[PDB]
């Protein structure tokens, strides 16, 4: 359960993706693959792209 900060805006195109703004704080639960994390933002659980966040 890692705290992450968004390095750039991400606009999800799927209900499986979270959308967030650069600078946002996100909670990352688990590293699903080298490119995806299961996380939560804005009270919603979903996938977070590794390329847009920093831990």
Curated annotation (Swiss-Prot):
Gene (UniProt): Srgap1
Protein name, as recorded: SLIT-ROBO Rho GTPase-activating protein 1
Cysteine disulfide partners in this protein: none
Function: GTPase-activating protein for RhoA and Cdc42 small GTPases. Together with CDC42 seems to be involved in the pathway mediating the repulsive signaling of Robo and Slit proteins in neuronal migration. SLIT2, probably through interaction with ROBO1, increases the interaction of SRGAP1 with ROBO1 and inactivates CDC42.
Full protein segment contained here: 725 to 776 of 1062
UniProt source species: Mus musculus (Mouse)
Quaternary structure, from the entry: Homodimer. Forms a heterooligomer with SRGAP2 and SRGAP3 through its F-BAR domain. Interacts with CDC42 and RHOA. Interacts with FASLG. Interacts (via SH3 domain) with ROBO1.
Domain notes: The F-BAR domain mediates oligomerization, binds membranes, and constrains plasma membrane protrusions.
Lineage: Eukaryota, Metazoa, Chordata, Craniata, Vertebrata
SH3 domain sequence ranges: 4-55
Domain of life: Eukaryota
């Amino acid at each position: 359960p890692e705290f992450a900060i968004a390095k750039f805006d991400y606009v999800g195109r799927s209900a499986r993706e979270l959308s967030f703004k650069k600078g946002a704080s996100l909670l990352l639960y688990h590293r699903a693959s080298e490119d995806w994390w299961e996380g939560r933002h804005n009270g919603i659980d979903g996938l977070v792209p590794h390329q847009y966040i920093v831990v």
